[PDB]
Scaffold this active site. Structure first.
Site, short mmCIF file in Angstrom:
data_model
loop_
_atom_site.label_atom_id
_atom_site.label_comp_id
_atom_site.label_asym_id
_atom_site.label_seq_id
_atom_site.Cartn_x
_atom_site.Cartn_y
_atom_site.Cartn_z
N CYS A 103 -1.26 9.15 4.00
CA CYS A 103 -1.30 8.65 2.63
C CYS A 103 -2.51 9.21 1.89
O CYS A 103 -2.45 9.45 0.68
CB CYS A 103 -1.33 7.11 2.62
SG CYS A 103 0.04 6.30 3.52
N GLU A 129 0.86 -1.17 0.00
CA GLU A 129 0.00 0.00 0.00
C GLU A 129 0.90 1.23 0.00
O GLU A 129 1.79 1.35 0.85
CB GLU A 129 -0.96 -0.06 1.19
CG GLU A 129 -1.80 -1.37 1.14
CD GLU A 129 -2.76 -1.46 -0.07
OE1 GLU A 129 -3.75 -0.70 -0.09
OE2 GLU A 129 -2.53 -2.27 -1.01
#
Ligand code: FAD
Lengths: 1205, 112, 56
Positions: free
Chosen positions: A822, A788
């Site tokens: 993120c 990720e």
């Protein structure tokens, strides 16, 4: 400075009366009601007398606008709404003759669209409430455009004229008393002669910038002059007054900013009060959200004690009876009136923010609500508080604001026979309560005065919060007095006696979940902490101080015990002088030894039944919950996080633990064997939550774990492992290996590593991918990698969005956690017609942020993680500045010098393509777009190749449908911020350059961590891909009967088209859907393998690129056109990308070779599945369809229009 | 009531498009609208913008909005029954243009 | 019942839609079958009439 020594000191020491308020903040509803029922009790004779008066008032109300228009022209509901929207727009034309010309010549002749950058229907939700009584969060603008064309073509100019005149009266005379204070004052003379009085509401609210608060101040000051001139010495009871909202007067009105509030907001209110004193008029402080109540008491206290305001009794204060603290607030205000000798004007209301309070408590995971959950409880609370006020008329002036004739009657008889003007009064809303109170005011009625609360403002101002003011709800009195299904007997019912006789007095509403019970039987929601609660702040202050006195360490915790190594200190990123602890880093030899120890212990941990592994996770969640205050202090000092963000991070870690435990209990059995040792590599920006989530999932799936925490944040990792081991995870099942990338790389390369879970940069993820492609499992299959990575996340805002709402969500999305999420907002896209206004507001709000060391509640934005991150971010800003781009930055205080800080920054770009790299800091880029170019803009957003989070601010359904159907991102957000994905509610993870999937905190996650994936809960679809069906018919035509049957089985087993709504808070809809991934690279070896790969890919909605080097082109002759459209052949894989996954057929050496070639493809890290020819023949699940669909999460704020339907 | 192909021309009898066929300018029927925009129409509009065919690009976007493709309604009726009415693409439309601009307008109508 | 429904349905659809710019076609020929000799007969005729067309 000592850590946490100045965290959140109260404005003043908390008196006994103030402590009783705070103690009641979230008191259980069963505890609040009995004393209110007792205080509201009246004699049988008075109850009968009040029932008679209320019946009489309701008789006159029922024996005495838009509906007549709808009737006259046979309008549908949508036509009525569309007409009112057209009228609103025509009324934005200032000159009457010009408007009438547009109507007569151009509007009525059709083609209304040609003559009227902003949808006509931006405010249709509000008109929908006016016309239908029902609230919609978003606007079906295509339905309204059709209705408007239909009604104009049917009825022409006469209906437009009637709509304009209707809208003109409503917006100029009914929703407001007047457009300006002068006009409002002229229109007030009529009812003042009949015995009413007035309080003017200048509709100011929620300042976003210093400039906005200044404008609101001068608006109040100028109204006070006009009202005071008009009052002409009538005094505070007979004459008019003003009402103000404190949130209008300062852009950071909150407990967290209490010092600024006392230093900057207080003197402004004092200057307004001094003017009200000179004219001798009322000045009322309106009540707002629950987390502002006690802060407002601190201003009320200083003002009432200020000698400069002595001699004037005009100061007023609202208390909300729907709040659990109301009687204790009243006790405090009555005591303050005694001490100061000021007869405080106390306006008793029920409360205007009910839906929002429910949603906020649920989002924040708090113990209970600060408001009642049953309307009848609020009614009892109101009557009890009126009894307390009526016993103190000598020291306060009660003002009973209500339209409920039963409430009115009860108070009228409770007050008894002695009355004089100034003893107490009633109040009502302009254009709403006059019907009721014209049966009250005057010697011919009840001879009790009423003050009219009179909104003043333009059409623009009025419409901004009209939704809240109308909420009109099914439970509302004016809705019921006007509902023919409700008898008078139902309307004059005594709420005190109804509550007294209920089985459990004060039971919570059955259909509202407490925050802990948001997920029902599935799992226990994590609990937060209320940073507006003084007792919580005082207790947290002590815990945080005690956490900074602990000698935190992190060691290589091998199966055999702690290991020795190179030891260095861990420093606070906000102040390098503050040593947080010490880390002993792992040697490359010990990391290799750790994998072998994990390998040796894997059977033992895999043998613990899934239920007992899940019990370990639930025990760890309980430990983290009890330890949250200490964990907060460590996260604050080690990772540079604010306390707010640290609470959310500990909640996330608890939620991961409980979510993966429940998913385990739902799915895992003996046939879902573990992969083996899993290397978990976690980042520094969520050093507890992502760390915990990856490790918890791997462990509960039966895998032993090697935990490699980020080099910057090993301490919270070590504490996390300590808690997991205490919860029962054996030391051989969970080893901690602190260190840099050498440790991470040694672990990934170890032959016994069976899987890697990575969250971090794309650059490192690609290096891990290349390492893993060198290896196969003992079964000869690729090593699973969950990676990720970052995102270049955008938000699109159109001209229908509310600027104040956008700016708040943008400020939070871009700069929360110094933009080190993120999910953080990197590019804001503003429709050209509103860009300059939103950018001005955004820059002004930027400069209200407090940047500094995060051991103070007042700090909004902390430091970035290292000096290297800082330098990298600043190099980007200076490049943009050197290119002549406009750059806005807040100035930093000198104290930031001892840490690594980047000031929140706004950079204005020409095109989205000006941003050519991810910048992991508090740096927002702004671009503008023309409305017609929206679809191209979405193309530009997609073209970056990232696909993590995406935000859209619009009220228009057509724009929602368009944008969300064309954007390619894993986590979508409508009319809210784009950060803080909630486990199990917004399963988190993107596509393309943003990740491999499956989503963390979602139902496919555990299945990636076992050799044979289980069937997730609710994972099915009744839809069948029609190209799959065409391919299966083609296979049957070719005689490939076995393949055709396998194709149909793939069509049924695919979960493509799954579409679920996930449980969560009120006022939000959280959706989870399975879509096609994209173009899958097919690397077949045999014709049958190709057919099986094509079926898997088509059944999941994908197109394919088939390796031309397979020589299997003659196997696909005469494909149906529908299937041909999805099939391409590729000689040069890197040229025909990007792909979204791959299917490989071959023996072990062929798979390794292909896997290496795939890893060398530029762009996204592909999720690759491999099988031998024999495996395809033997196992129908040789390729798993879970990994051939894309998960999409969408979170829609349905409270965005101003209320919760 | 009514079908496609060899079963008839439409519009359906006893449905909301019927009267519009018996006048020279059809009205907008009740409830006749859709929030969906055909994605190929969108791609065509951007292509027209690229060429500078501004009047046609505008006509394509207007067609994409006013199209009722994807309408999906439940009709009032008896209990124990669910009666649904949906608007789908027709198929392949024969275009007989005379001019380039005419062709662009015809494509926009059919793609939308 | 179907004949009655056609009459009332096209009446209501007219009340919802037709204005001065929706001009009639003119004379409409309505050719009906023997299998619904009142209902389809009535529906075609009622629709053409209410849209402002005289009917053959
Ligand atoms: C003159 C005036 C000034 C006002 N000033 C303010 C202000 O400064 N701040 C403020 O917050 N509001 C203010 N209000 C609004 C007031 O708080 C009420 O919410 C509203 O006016 C309706 O109350 P009611 O007695 O008229 O009608 P009712 O129908 O009797 O009461 C409705 C009220 O019940 C409450 N309620 C509804 N559902 C529930 C539920 N499920 N559980 C618990 N309670 C529920 C809500 O408070 C709702 O407003 C003011 C109102 C007036 C007339």
């Amino acid at each position: 400075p000592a850590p946490f020594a100045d965290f959140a000191p109260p404005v003043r020491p908390q008196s006994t009366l103030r402590r009783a308020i705070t103690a009641a903040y979230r008191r259980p509803e069963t505890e609040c009601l009995p004393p209110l029922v007792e205080a509201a009790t009246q004699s049988k004779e008075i109850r009968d007398a009040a029932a008679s008066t209320a019946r009489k008032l309701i008789e006159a109300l029922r024996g005495k606008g838009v509906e007549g228009l709808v009737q006259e022209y046979s309008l549908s509901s949508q036509e009525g709404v569309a007409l009112m929207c057209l009228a609103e727009a025509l009324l934005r034309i200032p000159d009457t003759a010009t408007r009438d010309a547009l109507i007569r010549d151009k509007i009525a002749d059709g083609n209304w669209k040609s003559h009227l950058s902003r949808s006509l229907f931006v405010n249709a939700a509000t008109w929908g409430l006016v016309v239908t009584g029902k609230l919609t969060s978003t606007v079906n603008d295509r339905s309204l455009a059709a209705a408007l064309t239909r009604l104009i073509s049917r009825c022409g100019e006469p209906v437009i004229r009637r709509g304009v005149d209707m809208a003109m009266r409503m917006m100029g005379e009914q929703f407001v008393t007047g457009e300006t204070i002068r006009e409002a004052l002229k229109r007030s003379k009529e009812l003042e002669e009949k015995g009413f009085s007035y309080s003017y509401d200048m509709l100011g609210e929620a300042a976003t910038t210093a400039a906005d608060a200044e404008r609101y101040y001068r608006d109040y000051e100028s109204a006070i002059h006009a009202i005071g001139k008009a009052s002409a010495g009538r005094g505070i009871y007979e004459g008019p007054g003003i009402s103000i909202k404190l949130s209008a007067l300062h852009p950071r009105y909150s407990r967290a900013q209490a010092a600024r509030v006392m230093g900057e907001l207080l003197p402004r209110v004092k200057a307004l009060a001094l003017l009200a004193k000179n004219y001798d008029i009322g000045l009322n402080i309106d009540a707002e959200e629950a987390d502002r109540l006690e802060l407002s008491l601190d201003l009320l206290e200083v003002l009432c004690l200020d000698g400069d305001l002595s001699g004037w009794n005009g100061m007023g204060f609202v208390v909300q009876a729907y709040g659990k603290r109301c009687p204790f607030v009243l006790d405090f205000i009555i005591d303050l009136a005694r001490r100061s000798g000021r007869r405080i004007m106390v306006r008793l209301v029920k409360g205007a923010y009910w839906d929002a309070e429910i949603k906020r408590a649920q989002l924040d995971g708090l113990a209970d609500f600060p408001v009642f959950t049953r309307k009848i409880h609020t009614d009892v609370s109101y009557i009890a508080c009126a009894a307390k006020l009526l016993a103190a008329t000598d020291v306060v002036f009660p003002q009973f604001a209500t339209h409920n004739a039963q409430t009115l009657a009860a108070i009228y008889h409770m007050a008894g026979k002695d009355f004089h003007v100034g003893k107490y009064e009633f109040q009502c809303l302009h254009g709403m309560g006059e019907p009721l109170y014209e049966e009250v005011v005057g010697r011919g009625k009840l001879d009790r005065p009423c003050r009219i609360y009179a909104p003043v403002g333009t059409h623009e101002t009025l419409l901004a919060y009209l939704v809240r003011r109308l909420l009109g709800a099914n439970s509302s009195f004016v809705h019921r007095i006007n509902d023919p299904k409700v008898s008078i007997d139902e309307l004059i019912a005594d709420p005190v006696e109804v509550v007294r006789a209920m089985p459990v007095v004060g039971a919570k509403h059955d259909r509202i979940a407490l925050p802990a019970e948001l997920f029902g039987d599935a799992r226990t929601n994590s609990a937060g902490l209320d940073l507006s609660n003084e007792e919580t702040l005082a207790s947290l202050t002590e815990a945080l101080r005690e956490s900074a006195a602990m000698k935190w360490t992190a060691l290589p915790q091998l199966a055999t015990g702690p290991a020795a190594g190179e030891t260095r200190t861990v420093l606070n990123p906000g102040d390098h002088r503050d040593v947080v602890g010490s880390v002993t880093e792992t040697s490359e030899e010990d990391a290799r030894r750790a994998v072998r120890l994990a390998a040796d212990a894997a059977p033992d941990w895999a043998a613990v039944p899934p239920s007992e592994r899940a019990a370990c996770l639930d025990r760890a969640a309980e430990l983290m919950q009890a330890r949250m205050p200490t964990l907060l202090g460590l996260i604050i000092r080690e990772a540079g996080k604010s306390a707010l963000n640290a609470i959310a991070e500990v909640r996330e870690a608890i939620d991961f633990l409980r979510y993966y435990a429940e998913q385990t209990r739902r799915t895992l059995g003996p046939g879902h064997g573990p992969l083996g040792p899993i290397v978990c590599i976690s980042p520094w920006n969520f050093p507890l939550a992502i760390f915990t989530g990856q490790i918890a999932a791997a462990l509960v799936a039966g895998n032993p774990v090697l935990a490699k925490p980020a080099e910057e944040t090993p301490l919270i990792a070590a504490e996390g492992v300590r808690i997991l081991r205490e919860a029962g995870i054996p030391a051989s099942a969970l080893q901690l290996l602190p260190g840099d990338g050498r440790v991470g790389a040694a672990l990934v390369a170890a032959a016994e590593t069976a899987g890697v879970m990575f969250t971090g940069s794309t650059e490192v993820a690609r290096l891990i991918q290349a390492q893993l492609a060198d290896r196969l499992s003992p079964a000869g299959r690729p090593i699973p990698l969950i990676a990720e990575t970052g995102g270049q996340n955008a938000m699109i805002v159109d001209s229908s969005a509310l600027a104040e709402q956008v700016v708040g969500d943008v400020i939070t999305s871009a700069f929360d956690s110094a933009g080190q999420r993120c999910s953080a907002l990197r590019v804001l896209c503003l429709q050209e017609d509103v860009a300059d206004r939103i950018l001005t507001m955004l820059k002004g709000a930027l400069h209200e942020l407090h940047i500094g060391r995060t051991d103070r509640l007042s700090v909004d934005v902390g430091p970035v993680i290292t000096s290297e991150a800082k330098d990298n971010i600043e190099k980007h800003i200076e490049r943009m500045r050197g290119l002549g781009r406009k750059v806005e930055q807040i100035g930093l205080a000198s104290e930031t010098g001892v840490g690594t800080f980047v000031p929140p920054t706004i950079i204005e770009l020409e095109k989205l393509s000006d941003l050519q790299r991810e910048v992991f800091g508090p740096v927002l880029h702004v671009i503008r777009y023309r409305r017609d170019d929206l679809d191209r803009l979405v193309d530009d957003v997609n073209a970056t190749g990232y696909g993590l989070t995406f935000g859209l601010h619009t009220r228009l359904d057509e724009t929602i449908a368009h944008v969300t159907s064309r954007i390619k991102a894993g986590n979508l957000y409508i009319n809210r911020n784009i950060i803080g994905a909630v486990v199990g509610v917004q399963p988190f993870g993107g596509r393309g350059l943003s990740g491999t999937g499956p989503k963390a905190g979602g139902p496919l996650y555990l299945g990636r961590l076992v050799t044979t994936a289980p069937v997730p809960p609710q994972h099915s679809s009744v839809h069948t891909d029609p190209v799959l069906l065409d391919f299966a018919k083609w296979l049957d035509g070719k005689g490939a009967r076995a393949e055709a049957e396998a194709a149909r089985n793939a069509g049924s087993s695919s979960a493509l088209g799954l579409d679920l709504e996930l449980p969560g808070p009120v006022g939000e809809r959280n959706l989870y859907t399975l879509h096609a991934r994209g173009r899958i690279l097919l690397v077949p070896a045999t014709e049958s393998g190709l057919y099986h790969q094509l079926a898997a890919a088509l059944a999941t909605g994908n197109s394919v690129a088939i390796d031309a080097a397979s020589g299997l082109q003659a196997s696909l002759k005469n494909l149906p056109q529908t299937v041909g459209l999805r099939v391409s052949w590729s000689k040069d894989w890197a040229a025909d990308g990007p792909f979204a996954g791959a299917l490989v057929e071959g023996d072990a050496e062929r798979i390794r070779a292909v896997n290496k070639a795939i890893a060398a493809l530029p762009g996204p890290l592909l999720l690759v599945q491999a099988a031998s020819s024999g495996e395809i023949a033997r196992n129908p699940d040789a390729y798993c369809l879970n990994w051939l669909v894309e998960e999409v999460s969408a979170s829609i704020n349905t409270a965005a229009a101003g209320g919760n339907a």
